Design a protein around this motif. Sequence first.
Motif, PDB file in Angstrom:
ATOM      1  N   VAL A 297      42.255  70.985  -0.212  1.00 50.44           N
ATOM      2  CA  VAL A 297      41.455  70.282  -0.913  1.00 50.44           C
ATOM      3  C   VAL A 297      40.314  70.992  -0.759  1.00 50.44           C
ATOM      4  O   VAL A 297      39.860  71.841  -0.190  1.00 50.44           O
ATOM      5  CB  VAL A 297      41.144  68.687  -0.299  1.00 50.44           C
ATOM      6  CG1 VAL A 297      42.500  67.985  -0.216  1.00 50.44           C
ATOM      7  CG2 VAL A 297      40.911  69.091   1.273  1.00 50.44           C
ATOM      8  N   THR A 298      39.067  70.386  -1.551  1.00 47.81           N
ATOM      9  CA  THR A 298      37.807  70.653  -1.136  1.00 47.81           C
ATOM     10  C   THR A 298      37.411  69.373  -0.120  1.00 47.81           C
ATOM     11  O   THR A 298      37.785  68.252  -0.361  1.00 47.81           O
ATOM     12  CB  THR A 298      36.726  70.472  -2.321  1.00 47.81           C
ATOM     13  OG1 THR A 298      35.429  70.624  -1.946  1.00 47.81           O
ATOM     14  CG2 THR A 298      36.704  69.166  -2.884  1.00 47.81           C
ATOM     15  N   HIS A 299      36.566  69.714   0.880  1.00 50.73           N
ATOM     16  CA  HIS A 299      36.643  68.927   2.165  1.00 50.73           C
ATOM     17  C   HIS A 299      35.199  67.898   2.005  1.00 50.73           C
ATOM     18  O   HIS A 299      34.534  67.274   2.787  1.00 50.73           O
ATOM     19  CB  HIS A 299      36.922  69.386   3.478  1.00 50.73           C
ATOM     20  CG  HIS A 299      37.345  68.265   4.558  1.00 50.73           C
ATOM     21  ND1 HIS A 299      36.718  67.353   4.819  1.00 50.73           N
ATOM     22  CD2 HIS A 299      38.629  68.608   5.010  1.00 50.73           C
ATOM     23  CE1 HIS A 299      37.427  66.703   5.743  1.00 50.73           C
ATOM     24  NE2 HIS A 299      38.614  67.328   5.901  1.00 50.73           N
ATOM     25  N   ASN A 300      34.825  67.676   0.537  1.00 50.80           N
ATOM     26  CA  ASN A 300      34.132  66.505   0.248  1.00 50.80           C
ATOM     27  C   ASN A 300      35.514  65.395  -0.015  1.00 50.80           C
ATOM     28  O   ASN A 300      35.825  65.812  -1.106  1.00 50.80           O
ATOM     29  CB  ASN A 300      33.093  66.488  -0.787  1.00 50.80           C
ATOM     30  CG  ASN A 300      32.635  65.018  -0.852  1.00 50.80           C
ATOM     31  OD1 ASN A 300      33.046  64.439  -0.943  1.00 50.80           O
ATOM     32  ND2 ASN A 300      31.065  65.133  -0.959  1.00 50.80           N
ATOM     33  N   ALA A 304      37.967  65.071  -3.098  1.00 52.43           N
ATOM     34  CA  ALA A 304      39.185  65.563  -3.004  1.00 52.43           C
ATOM     35  C   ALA A 304      40.296  64.160  -3.709  1.00 52.43           C
ATOM     36  O   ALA A 304      41.140  64.493  -4.266  1.00 52.43           O
ATOM     37  CB  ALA A 304      39.690  65.834  -1.883  1.00 52.43           C
ATOM     38  N   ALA A 305      39.763  62.953  -3.058  1.00 52.15           N
ATOM     39  CA  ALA A 305      40.989  61.918  -3.295  1.00 52.15           C
ATOM     40  C   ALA A 305      40.422  61.369  -4.416  1.00 52.15           C
ATOM     41  O   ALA A 305      41.462  60.749  -5.143  1.00 52.15           O
ATOM     42  CB  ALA A 305      40.945  61.076  -2.133  1.00 52.15           C
ATOM     43  N   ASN A 306      39.132  61.118  -4.841  1.00 50.37           N
ATOM     44  CA  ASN A 306      38.802  60.146  -5.838  1.00 50.37           C
ATOM     45  C   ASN A 306      38.505  60.945  -7.228  1.00 50.37           C
ATOM     46  O   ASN A 306      38.246  60.235  -8.330  1.00 50.37           O
ATOM     47  CB  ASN A 306      37.861  59.145  -5.458  1.00 50.37           C
ATOM     48  CG  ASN A 306      38.211  58.261  -4.422  1.00 50.37           C
ATOM     49  OD1 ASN A 306      39.319  58.299  -3.914  1.00 50.37           O
ATOM     50  ND2 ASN A 306      37.274  57.701  -3.645  1.00 50.37           N
TER      51      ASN A 306
ATOM     52  N   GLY C 131      45.905  58.069   3.742  1.00 51.68           N
ATOM     53  CA  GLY C 131      46.450  58.533   2.426  1.00 51.68           C
ATOM     54  C   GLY C 131      45.725  58.168   1.380  1.00 51.68           C
ATOM     55  O   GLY C 131      45.140  57.119   1.231  1.00 51.68           O
ATOM     56  N   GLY C 132      45.501  58.784   0.148  1.00 49.38           N
ATOM     57  CA  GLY C 132      44.966  58.493  -0.930  1.00 49.38           C
ATOM     58  C   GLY C 132      43.316  58.309  -0.891  1.00 49.38           C
ATOM     59  O   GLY C 132      42.930  58.804   0.065  1.00 49.38           O
TER      60      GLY C 132
END
Lengths: 345, 345, 345
Positions: A297-300, A304-306, C131-132
Amino acid sequence: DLKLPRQRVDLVAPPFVHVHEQATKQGPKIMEFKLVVQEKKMVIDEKGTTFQAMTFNGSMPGPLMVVHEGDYVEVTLVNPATNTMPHNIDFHSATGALGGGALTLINPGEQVVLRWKATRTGVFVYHCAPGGPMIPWHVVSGMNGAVMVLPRDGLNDGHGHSLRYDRIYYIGEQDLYVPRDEKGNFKSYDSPGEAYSDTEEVMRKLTPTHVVFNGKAGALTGKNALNANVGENVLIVHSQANRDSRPHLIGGHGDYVWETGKFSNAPETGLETWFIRGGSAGAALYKFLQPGIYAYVTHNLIEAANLGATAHFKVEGKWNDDLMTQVKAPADIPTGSTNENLYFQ
Amino acid sequence: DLKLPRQRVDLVAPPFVHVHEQATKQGPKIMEFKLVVQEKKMVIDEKGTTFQAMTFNGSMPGPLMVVHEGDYVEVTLVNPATNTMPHNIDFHSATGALGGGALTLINPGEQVVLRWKATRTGVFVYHCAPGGPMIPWHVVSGMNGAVMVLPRDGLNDGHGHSLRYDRIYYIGEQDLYVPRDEKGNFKSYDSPGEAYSDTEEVMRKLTPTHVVFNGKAGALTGKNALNANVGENVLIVHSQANRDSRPHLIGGHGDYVWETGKFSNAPETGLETWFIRGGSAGAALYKFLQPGIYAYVTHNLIEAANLGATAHFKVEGKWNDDLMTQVKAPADIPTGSTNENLYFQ
Amino acid sequence: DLKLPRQRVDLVAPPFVHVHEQATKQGPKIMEFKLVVQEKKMVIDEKGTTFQAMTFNGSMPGPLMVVHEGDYVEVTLVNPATNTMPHNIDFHSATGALGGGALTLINPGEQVVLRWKATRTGVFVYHCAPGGPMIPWHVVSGMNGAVMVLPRDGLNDGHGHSLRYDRIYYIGEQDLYVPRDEKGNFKSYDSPGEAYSDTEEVMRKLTPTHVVFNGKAGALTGKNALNANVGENVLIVHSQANRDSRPHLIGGHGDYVWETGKFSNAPETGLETWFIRGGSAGAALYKFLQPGIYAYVTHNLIEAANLGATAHFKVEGKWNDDLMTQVKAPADIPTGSTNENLYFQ
Ligand SMILES: OC[C@H]1O[C@@](CO)(O[C@H]2O[C@H](CO)[C@@H](O)[C@H](O)[C@H]2O)[C@@H](O)[C@@H]1O
Ligand SMILES: OC[C@H]1O[C@@](CO)(O[C@H]2O[C@H](CO)[C@@H](O)[C@H](O)[C@H]2O)[C@@H](O)[C@@H]1O
Ligand SMILES: OC[C@H]1O[C@@](CO)(O[C@H]2O[C@H](CO)[C@@H](O)[C@H](O)[C@H]2O)[C@@H](O)[C@@H]1O
Ligand SMILES: [Cu+2]
Ligand SMILES: [Cu+2]
Ligand SMILES: [Cu+2]
Ligand SMILES: [Cu+2]
Ligand SMILES: [Cu+2]
Ligand SMILES: [Cu+2]
């Protein structure tokens, strides 16, 4: 008058990388590559949002080119007449003429041949840069990739020991700026030129709507997860031509990281998260020690997730309970536990 | 009781730098500088937008001060009674009293004399910091510059070899926060105090409206491009007192870069793009190898092309076709070409 | 089958740190820690704005865990049935299973025991990651802290000399995303789940409403300023699990800084401002040389002064007029002064 062997390289689509030698006893060659500009609509997220993209060789990122220190790199850039705009190419690895941009501007229906000497080792960005406000617009529309210039002796740890990778992947990260209508829905357009004015408004606020690897949210998850095996030393090249990123392998580390991406400098060891400055490429080695899924991921974590910036590795092998183990699986909190007496209650 | 030779330094407007010795066999001196605060309206972009600025010595950035390790730096800060607000100065190079800010607060009509010992080598930011929300407002209104503290032996490459520059430039980058009216047009004000409340609203969203070098979009392009010659080793000092930047010389490299800006640490070699953390100054050496125009940018290309953050170098000399050449100029794509068979079609 | 001494550690609330040895001749132990998840409303700024927080051990950040290279770390994570959501924990210091997250998901009313070996030295983030889209939401709601893995010989300067701190503080920086109503006022909610949809909208724009140390604007100012004495070597561990930061000690320096936070790499010396990449922890040593107030900030001064990210140190001791002195206190500008003749007028 440049009398050297020529060798044609066939590029491949990221995140894979064309075949090459790490260490080589071959002398300098003229390494011949071809990049073809393709403007096209592309899908960029899991809800099917489309985007008027501009690409080298039809992919975001453009393909990774791999050469050795002292090679000459002869690039034919082709802009087919199906395209609508002028394009060019600028190599951060090259010296002079704005990295080549000042020698490579081509209208649709034209091609151009540039040669640059690979005098600087490392991984480097290349991107389109036609001039003025066209420069950010072409880059954030997808027109960027990377080149790796290896030392002829391959990588080393900066302390006189050789490093060799068993596997290489190229992760290009792209910040995208997709206009929304009044209701907040992403807008679609029939051409890049039609998208431009609304896109420039989003670009000016400096906040991407999507941050993706290999061109789309989910590109490197599911069926297209990256493969590895316990024990393999994997090189992960990461580029970002326009915006910073902070790569992190969830469950792993960067054993050796050149976050500014240049092999004349010793790598840092044992990093949790590293930093790719916008406009650059970096590279990290890691030897997998545990099987299972890893997220890269990029660790913002919001990005990463959204906003799309997660890849997966699927690693085969045997679990090492010495490094980590679940000592007791989830269970009900014991009736006899006394957590109400803890300092923070 | 400090019995040392005194020497008065006359500062000059950036991006130029007052005369100084790189290596010196002079012992420590008291180096005397004067900074005068000037609040004034200034033009900050190519469409003529004006801004209520606050400056040291009438320029954004403030001038570069250059001293040597072990010197004492005696600064007279003057706040003329034509100004409206209190001001002070804080030197990141200094030790104690909030960098001097706690000893230098002056009302209009006053001056103050601070002395600090230059115990730390490197380039460092200085800026106004009157207290509380006034601190960001004074800095983003223009009240910041830099000081360079050279080792007495000049620069070195961290591996025991001397480095000497033929030319030095100071690039101060400024993030600006200019209010807009309902129609999206930039608003004008008759004084800093009048601008404050609307400006603070823009500042809170952390997204600048302009990102400029030497105080204005276009300041270092056209007639005011930076000059150099092929073969010269040029030192480029870059500061940013409030926001990160990622400098890149288009067509060149950073041969030696101290991106955290401190000469006790060896520089990194051969960088494409480096990183100036907000609140710091960094420095990069480069020996020009090719003539022509170079652009020096922050490599968020949206900021570089669309918000003002591009400078140019104009470099005189002879082109080196070995490093780069246009092998074939733009031409029509050959009728016989077969690009429809490429992997990505 | 792991036959090692067990030792229970009692954690304490940041910014303080549980007692530990720097250098140790003890062999590897199983170090036992307990973290209890607490969801609760918390006050996050000086105007009393409240926030639906989620915490480890009731604090933002979670407590600093300190172990030595080669120790095994056995964490009991407890999720009491007063909580509403599942939680887990992921240690950037650990190898495998997404840092432990894939082995620690617990519903309210459950606990779980994870063991990981401390094979990598440095300071590292830990955080919840269910998660997510739950991953960023739990982290920016407060569910993150740090672990320090010291070499068994303590810290060193990367050039073969031992470093020892007299005092350690853990500064956790938190970016918060608090919804506003139409009038611009912060909204209050009765539960985390109720806050979620509006909070996710603010998160997507990537611009925090608050940036705080130790959980609240003003947490480490006034009565809760950090104490030190002239001559003490103070270690300041700084973490940011989601967003970059650029720490700066106003009036001081970082004498030795591991900005990527990993003790296998030599620290940089004499920094003005350093850089914590989002998703990481870093650490800086400084030996205080002057008494007085120091501010410790992120050097985006808008975030420091206007969004909550300032701490203070109060340092006792004797002032050193050699390092800095006020040569002349504020006085009226002399009638005879000639500032109208300066170059910039
Ligand atoms: O001042 C010399 C003059 O030469 C020009 C002519 O166009 O070109 C030089 O630079 C080019 C790359 O930027 C080379 O391809 C060319 O061969 C070299 O002669 C001008 O740019 C310049 O004004
Ligand atoms: O605790 C001592 C006391 O001394 C003060 C008096 O104002 O000043 C000291 O610090 C100043 C710089 O911050 C020096 O200029 C001054 O000479 C030194 O004596 C207080 O700050 C402090 O409470
Ligand atoms: O392919 C093997 C298979 O084993 C699994 C079973 O759940 O578990 C392994 O990985 C776990 C950590 O991720 C360990 O706790 C476990 O003991 C180990 O056997 C699967 O993940 C995997 O499909
Ligand atoms: Cu293009
Ligand atoms: Cu570029
Ligand atoms: Cu001021
Ligand atoms: Cu400062
Ligand atoms: Cu949680
Ligand atoms: Cu993480």
